[PDB]
Amino acid sequence: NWISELIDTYRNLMNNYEVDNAVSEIVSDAIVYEDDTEVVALNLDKSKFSPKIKNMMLDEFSDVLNHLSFQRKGSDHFRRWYVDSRIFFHKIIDPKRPKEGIKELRRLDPRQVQYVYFIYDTAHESYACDGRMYEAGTKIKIPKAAVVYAHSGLVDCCGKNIIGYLHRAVKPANQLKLLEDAVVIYRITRAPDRRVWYVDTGNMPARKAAEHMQHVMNTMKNRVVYDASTGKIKNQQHNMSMTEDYWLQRRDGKAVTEVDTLPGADNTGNMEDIRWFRQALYMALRVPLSRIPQDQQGGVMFDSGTSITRDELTFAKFIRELQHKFEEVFLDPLKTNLLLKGIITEDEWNDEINNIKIEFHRDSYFAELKEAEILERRINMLTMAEPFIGKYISHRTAMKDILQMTDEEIEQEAKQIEEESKEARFQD
Amino acid sequence: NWISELIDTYRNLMNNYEVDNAVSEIVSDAIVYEDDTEVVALNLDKSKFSPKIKNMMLDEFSDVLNHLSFQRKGSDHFRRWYVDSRIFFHKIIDPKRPKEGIKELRRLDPRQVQYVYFIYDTAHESYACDGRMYEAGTKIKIPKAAVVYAHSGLVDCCGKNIIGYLHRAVKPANQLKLLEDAVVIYRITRAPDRRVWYVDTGNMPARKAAEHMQHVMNTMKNRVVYDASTGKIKNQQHNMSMTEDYWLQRRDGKAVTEVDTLPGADNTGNMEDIRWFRQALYMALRVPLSRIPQDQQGGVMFDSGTSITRDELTFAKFIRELQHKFEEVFLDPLKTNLLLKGIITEDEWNDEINNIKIEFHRDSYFAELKEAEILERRINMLTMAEPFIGKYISHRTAMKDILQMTDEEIEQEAKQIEEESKEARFQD
Amino acid sequence: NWISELIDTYRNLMNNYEVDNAVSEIVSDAIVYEDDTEVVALNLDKSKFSPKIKNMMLDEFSDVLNHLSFQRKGSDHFRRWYVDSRIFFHKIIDPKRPKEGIKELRRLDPRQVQYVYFIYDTAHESYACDGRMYEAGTKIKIPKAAVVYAHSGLVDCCGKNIIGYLHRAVKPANQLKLLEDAVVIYRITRAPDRRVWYVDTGNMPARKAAEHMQHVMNTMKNRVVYDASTGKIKNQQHNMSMTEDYWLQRRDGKAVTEVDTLPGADNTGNMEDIRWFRQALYMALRVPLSRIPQDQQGGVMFDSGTSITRDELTFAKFIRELQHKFEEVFLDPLKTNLLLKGIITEDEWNDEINNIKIEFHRDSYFAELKEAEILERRINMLTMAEPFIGKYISHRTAMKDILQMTDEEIEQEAKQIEEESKEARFQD
């Protein structure tokens, strides 16, 4: 239940704006679709028994994505993992025969699952599984296999509870807005001039004294209105009074009946205040500040090509750490399906990972725009430390520590470059 | 009903300005008509049985656009999808014979449709379908086929409800204007000087005391007016009094009758306030801030050709994600018409998508102006790392990682470039 | 117990943001995963009996990481060491036979361990060890071997107690926030204009005097509201009153009934105050200030490649000192397993360390970007002091004190560079 109230407030963090902008900053590059290029490949770079089995996984893996319908439904499944604070896929298998094998993976609403042996609470009717039939309103129990349970790997203030990654920004977000209601509340109110009219009546009953109040309304009450639909001043057509005229009569021989205007909202503020808490909520999100929240006029800095800051570089790391947590949602539908189906056993799997890397695709554009500053500097070094490359540092030695190549890259290239010189078209 | 009240407030978000400017920012490039060039092509880049069937779709697809009348009615159907939060096209088929096949797709008003099996509520009389005749005022039921239902793929605060994409900006928009009425309300009011005239009368009945009030009006009341039609001061022709003169008589021997001017609207503000909430509503829209809301005098930054920022680059991604949601409105009138008509069955279709890409056309101008900075930098690298292209990195190796070409592009070109040299006109 | 309350407040330092940002600044580079490259290698650069035993450790050490599951669970085990202020791994061995040898290392919750002979307090049921069975709710005692106990090597104010490294920043952090509640508390309150209405009633019982108060509410009470869900003004549709009108009646012939508005929150501040304490908490963390907390517009400074400051250089030192404290968590599961298993005895081990260095991997990117300024300056010297290299300083002499090489590097290179000149491709 406490688990369930938590995934509420996270999802009412997304409801608000900016949090939505910054969270979908991440999911926009924590799994980035590109044209032609694929997302979430199964890099196999480890000792495997057959050249056929290592490629056989594609029959398994390029298909296990289909069940998630991952190609058009990925950046929601992940954006759910991250913001939900948990994500459960129920697994239908099989019912028979074994090694058929398996069936569609259906997402489960977090907040309807308890884990002490998974207790799926059912709101309304969701599914009939293999058998016997669709349960209704009852807590159905599913074993800790096979259900993929991927959690944001966070301990929390007191062990052991699951939290994040939005948590650290919940308190900050609740008090950035607690200013935006304050800043409009100050201005809305007092926007209209208010006036308190004190008129006195001594020694007359409230029954008939109020009659001396019914007369100062029906004679001097103001109907002037401003409507936000069309900005016109209703019941005042046409033109505007150059000036007003209110007429009060202090019945006694003393100055007690008067209008005292209540204060106008003088704008002393001076508002560097909210501008403080917005930079907070933004640091608390985990999104780099170099995304442009500020107007950032010009300046410019300046440079023709924006460089890799350490900010942005950090964040790629935060991401590629995420992807390695959401890595889970691929490896336990696969491994239980690659055991259900046959081939490799569990006792063989243990040694392979180790490394059976799942490569997410990065953004094609900033792979280049990063690898262009790396290579820009390595050539700038190399031109600079060039007249000495004959005299002090070998050619091989610079090529491998100024260019940061490796040996078999120089080997491969040295052989290759021979035919370039045979003969056209670069012979000058 | 709640669904229907929602699509109301979205459409009363468009009513306002800026929201209109920013929403039609999107639809201006989420489907961009250009001259000569076509919009919404059916890219077929997958294994298909016949060279004739893959081109046969044009008889199907270049015609399925006609039913939407998409060529002159596209940027409204989409601008409706996006802002409506839903979009339904009823499908007329057939009534007979099968594979005729089909008929015009008629848009349905959202807010008159309920989905639990589609319940089309009818306001007035809309259509007679194939049979039997035009229903009037009654909830007619249409099966979940065949009606194309395209929704903005959003879960909302509580599952499962449909929202967006305008939602996040609804609250912000309602309180940017709640300031613009405040800022005029402060100024309209008090624009005219108001004066409260206290004149006293002790120990005379209100019946005859009011007669001592009828005399201070008919002698000193001001008729001076300013009319907004023509800015002249009515009943004051010609010239303007150099100064005024009001005459009051404190009947008692004490200072109780007087004019107290009510405060003037002193402009202390100091208005960096609304300028806050307009930058909000604008971030909440999803339109990049680099569109020029600000005056942006000069500066300049400066550069002769405006570069691709990361802002703008992000947004192209947000768009091409939309287009892939509005992709739906093409593939289920087509697939149900490509099964109605014959040829490919449903069991064959499942493997094709996968990929049967629907290419929207981008803006011709900024394809270039982007592909000009990419290529500007790749040549700038290539000139810079040129003296080493003989010595360290092969020609092939640079051509494929400094220019980012591919092999069959170099293959194709190497063969091609031979005849350029045979012989004119570039031989110098 | 005091030990246990301490590890509470540290973990409620992490709960807060920024502390989380700065602590994971460290762990992001106190153990940095990289692709392909490994983390935590066992550098053996000392006299060892066999060429086989020195590599035999990998069977031992590349496996002792597996028990920690260090490859995907490292930057949590360390981030726990640092923030917890202690970290205990219980060691399961064996139960028989000896030299089997050993079993999984299970993390222990700090706050449930007392050391005077380790007293593991058990909350609920955690493990059954080899025998006899899982204890419940009782203080089980484990000998000071074998349990790895790694502490942040800090003495504290009074010897001998364990503290840090977060301690110095606890007081500062508790009073940066004691301002952020102050700064919103000032603004929240008074955000709404408050008015105190004094109305008088002399010589009437409180039983019936309150009836003269029930009437000024039900006639003049204001229901105008602003709701933060949707920013609209509830019960006020449509448009906004241009102005207000409140009507009070001083029953006596004297000015005693009136509205006195309570002060508005004038924003004199002038807030360079919190901006003070945030720079404190940030210096107290130990994270360099050159990470970009400030907006840091432009300027720029300027340079195309950001240099190694002395700040950043210091911090690498603070880190590599940490890693040498967390070095412990590798060497006592290894040495007790390399004695349990056999081979080297304790009397042999004493001489080896000395040096049996455990190399953490640094960040691949800033090894380069540091080693590029070092080498940039050594060449800049060398070009500058070049015409004299024939006349005054030898070639050997400059090569070894301008380039900072060593002899066997020049030896090795001089031999190598001969074949470069035999003959292609650099012969110009």
* DSSP secondary structure string for all residues of B193-204: EEEEEE----SS
CA gap B266, A265 in Å, rounded: 10
Q: Which residues contact C275 (CB under 8 A, 6 or more apart)?
A: none
CA gap B92, B147 in Å, rounded: 9
Q: Which residues contact B284 (CB under 8 A, 6 or more apart)?
A: A17, A18, A21, B168, B169, B172, B173
Angle at C374 between CA C369 and CA C375, to 5 degrees: 95
Q: How far is CA A124 from CA B200, C108, C347, in A?
A: 75, 42, 70
Nearest to C265 by CA among C179, C192, C197, C178: C192
Partner residue facing A198 (CB), from C16, C250, C375: C250
Cα pseudo-dihedral A217, A223, A224, A226, rounded to 10: 130
Cα pseudo-dihedral B360, B364, B366, B367, rounded to 10: 70
CA gap B300, B304 in Å, rounded: 10
User: Which token pair is C55?
Assistant: 């590599």
Please state the separation of Cα A308 from the chain's center in Å: 22
Residues C265 and C186: beta-carbon distance below 8 Å: yes
Nearest to A84 by CA among A166, A25, A29: A166
User: Which token pair is B199?
Assistant: 């004149």
Q: What is the DSSP letter of C392?
A: T
Nearest to A262 by CA among B180, B200, B248, C222: C222
Nearest to B23 by CA among B35, B34, B11, B40: B11
Residues A75 and A33: beta-carbon distance below 8 Å: yes
Residues A136 and A120: beta-carbon distance below 8 Å: no
User: Which token pair is A132?
Assistant: 């016997």
CA gap A54, A60 in Å, rounded: 11
Coil, helix or strand for A192?
coil
Residue B43's identity, in one-letter code, is N
C73 in reach of chain B (CB within 8 A): no
B260-289: burial string, b at 16+ Cβ within 10 Å, e else: eebeeeeeebeeebbebbbbbbbbbbbbbb
Mutation target among A5, A193, A278 for the B interface, most CBs of B within 10 A: A193
B265: chain A residues, CB-CB within 8 Å: 264
Partner residue facing C230 (CB), from B174, B185, B391: B174
SS3 annotation, B68-86: HCHHHHHHHHHHHHHHHCC
CA gap A328, A338 in Å, rounded: 15
User: Which token pair is C321?
Assistant: 């000192």
CA gap C47, C35 in Å, rounded: 32
Q: What is the C-alpha R_g of chain A?
A: 35
Nearest CA in chain B to A262: B263
Q: What is the C-alpha R_g of chain B?
A: 35
User: Which token pair is B116?
Assistant: 């639990």
Q: What is the DSSP letter of A113?
A: E
A293-318: burial string, b at 16+ Cβ within 10 Å, e else: beebeeebeeeeebebebebebbbeb
Answer yes or no: do C251 and A201 touch at CB < 8 A: yes
Question: Distance, in angstroms, between C244 CA and closest chain B CA?
Answer: 11
Instruction: Please state the φ and ψ torsions of residue B323, each to the nearest 5 degrees.
Output: -40, -35
SS3 annotation, C91-139: ECCCCCCCCCCCCCEEEECCCCEEECCEEECCCCCCCCCCCCCCCCCCC
Q: Which residues contact B288 (CB under 8 A, 6 or more apart)?
A: B309, B311, B312, B314, B315
Answer yes or no: do B181 and C242 touch at CB < 8 A: no
Residues paired with B260 in a beta bridge:
B196
C130 in reach of chain A (CB within 8 A): no
Angle at A270 between CA A268 and CA A275, to 5 degrees: 145
Task: Tell me the resolution in Å.
Answer: 3.6
Characterise B345 by phi-psi region: left (phi > 0), alpha (psi -120 to 50), beta (else).
beta
Residues paired with A226 in a beta bridge:
C240
B193 in reach of chain A (CB within 8 A): yes
Cα pseudo-dihedral C414, C416, C419, C420, rounded to 10: -90
Answer yes or no: do B181 and C240 touch at CB < 8 A: yes
Strands B147-150 and A87-91: unpaired
CA gap B356, A63 in Å, rounded: 18
C162-194: burial string, b at 16+ Cβ within 10 Å, e else: bbbbbbebbebbeebbeebeebbeebbebbebe
Answer yes or no: do B189 and C242 touch at CB < 8 A: yes
Nearest to C290 by CA among C272, C308, C273: C308
Coil, helix or strand for C184?
helix
Annotate B289-326 with DSSP letters as a single string.
TTS--S-------S-SS----HHHHHHHHHHHHHTTTT
CA gap B273, C351 in Å, rounded: 72
Q: What is the largest CA-CA distance in chain B?
A: 120
Q: What sign results for the dihedral spanned by CA atoms A382, A387, A389, A392?
A: negative
Please state the separation of Cα B397 from the chain's center in Å: 46
Residues comprising chain A, all counted: 428
ω into C118 cis (within 30 of 0): no
Question: Distance, in angstroms, between C133 CA and closest chain A CA?
Answer: 21
Residue C233's identity, in one-letter code, is I
CA gap C197, C261 in Å, rounded: 9
Residue A56 CA neighbour count, 13 Å, CB half: 13
Nearest CA in chain C to B171: C230
A201 in reach of chain C (CB within 8 A): yes
Question: For residue B317, how many other CB atoms are within 10 A of its CB?
Answer: 15
Mutation target among C193, C401, C404 for the A interface, most CBs of A within 10 A: C193
Residue C200's identity, in one-letter code, is D
Q: What sign results for the dihedral spanned by CA atoms C273, C274, C275, C281?
A: positive
Q: Which residues contact A26 (CB under 8 A, 6 or more apart)?
A: A82, A286, A287, A319, A322
Coil, helix or strand for A73?
helix
C240 in reach of chain B (CB within 8 A): yes
Residue A219 CA neighbour count, 13 Å, CB half: 13
Residues C107 and C51: beta-carbon distance below 8 Å: no
Strands A243-248 and B193-198: parallel
Residues A362 and A32: beta-carbon distance below 8 Å: yes
Residue B349's identity, in one-letter code, is W
ω into B300 cis (within 30 of 0): yes
Look-up: residue for tokens 């924006």? Answer: A306
Nearest CA in chain A to B418: A425
Answer yes or no: do B209 and A72 touch at CB < 8 A: no
Angle at A328 between CA B155 and CA A359, to 5 degrees: 95
Coil, helix or strand for B158?
coil
Residues B91 and B333: beta-carbon distance below 8 Å: yes
In C268-287, the residues whose Cβ lies within 8 Å of chain A are 268-271, 274
Q: What is the largest CA-CA distance in chain C?
A: 120
Residues A268 and C267: beta-carbon distance below 8 Å: yes
Answer yes or no: do A76 and B153 touch at CB < 8 A: yes
A111: chain B residues, CB-CB within 8 Å: none
Percent composition of chain A: helix, strand, coil (DSSP 3-state, to 5): 40, 10, 50
Question: Distance, in angstroms, between A49 CA and closest chain B CA?
Answer: 30
Q: How far is CA C357 from CA C43, C44, C328, in A?
A: 5, 7, 11
Q: What sign results for the dihedral spanned by CA atoms A419, A420, A423, A427?
A: negative
Helices and strands counted in chain C (H then E)? 16, 12
Residue B121's identity, in one-letter code, is D
Q: What sign results for the dihedral spanned by CA atoms A290, A294, A298, A300?
A: negative
Residues paired with A193 in a beta bridge:
C243
Mutation target among B200, B352, B357 for the A interface, most CBs of A within 10 A: B200
Cα pseudo-dihedral B124, B126, B127, B132, rounded to 10: -10
Residues B362 and B34: beta-carbon distance below 8 Å: no
Question: For residue B153, how many other CB atoms are within 10 A of its CB?
Answer: 17
Nearest to C105 by CA among C136, C70, C132, C140: C70
CA gap A191, B182 in Å, rounded: 5
CA gap C307, C370 in Å, rounded: 8
Residues C40 and C147: beta-carbon distance below 8 Å: no
Mutation target among C23, C262, C267 for the A interface, most CBs of A within 10 A: C267
C76 in reach of chain A (CB within 8 A): yes
Answer yes or no: do B256 and A253 touch at CB < 8 A: yes
C28 in reach of chain A (CB within 8 A): yes
Answer yes or no: do A259 and B254 touch at CB < 8 A: no
Answer yes or no: do A200 and C253 touch at CB < 8 A: yes
ω into B272 cis (within 30 of 0): no
| Helix or strand run (H / E) with residue B359 | strand B358-359
A244 in reach of chain C (CB within 8 A): no
Strands A243-248 and B87-91: unpaired
Coil, helix or strand for B120?
strand
- N- to C-terminal Cα distance for chain A? 77
Instruction: Please state the φ and ψ torsions of residue C23, each to the nearest 5 degrees.
Output: -70, -35
Coil, helix or strand for A318?
helix
Residues paired with C197 in a beta bridge:
C259
Instruction: Please state the φ and ψ torsions of residue A186, each to the nearest 5 degrees.
Output: -70, -40
A374 in reach of chain B (CB within 8 A): no
CA gap A349, B398 in Å, rounded: 40
B188 in reach of chain C (CB within 8 A): yes
Instruction: Please state the φ and ψ torsions of residue B254, each to the nearest 5 degrees.
Output: -160, 150
Residue C405 CA neighbour count, 13 Å, CB half: 19
CA gap B260, A248 in Å, rounded: 11
Coil, helix or strand for C42?
strand
Answer yes or no: do A299 and C304 touch at CB < 8 A: no
CA gap A66, A92 in Å, rounded: 15
Residues B355 and B42: beta-carbon distance below 8 Å: no
CA gap B130, B103 in Å, rounded: 10
Answer yes or no: do A206 and C184 touch at CB < 8 A: no
Residues paired with C91 in a beta bridge:
C105
Partner residue facing C254 (CB), from A256, A284, A302: A256
Helical ranges in B235-372 per DSSP H: 274-285, 310-322, 328-335, 337-340, 346-352, 364-370
Is residue A121 packed enough to be buried (19+ CB in 10 Å), middle (13-18) or exposed (0-12)?
middle
Coil, helix or strand for A260?
strand
Residues paired with B259 in a beta bridge:
B197
User: Which token pair is B317?
Assistant: 């991604």
ω into A79 cis (within 30 of 0): no
Residues paired with B261 in a beta bridge:
B195
Residues C373 and C307: beta-carbon distance below 8 Å: yes
Instruction: Please state the φ and ψ torsions of residue B338, each to the nearest 5 degrees.
Output: -95, 15
| Helix or strand run (H / E) with residue B261 | strand B258-261
Nearest to A387 by CA among C428, B192, C48, C66: C428
Nearest to C176 by CA among C285, C276, C265: C276
Annotate A356-419 with DSSP letters as a single string.
--EEPP--HHHHHHHTTHHHHHHHHHHHHT-TTTTTTS-HHHHHHHTS---HHHHHHHHHHHHH
Look-up: residue for tokens 């810079």? Answer: B384
Nearest to A112 by CA among A137, A145, A132, A129: A137
Answer yes or no: do B390 and C425 touch at CB < 8 A: yes
Answer yes or no: do B197 and A245 touch at CB < 8 A: yes
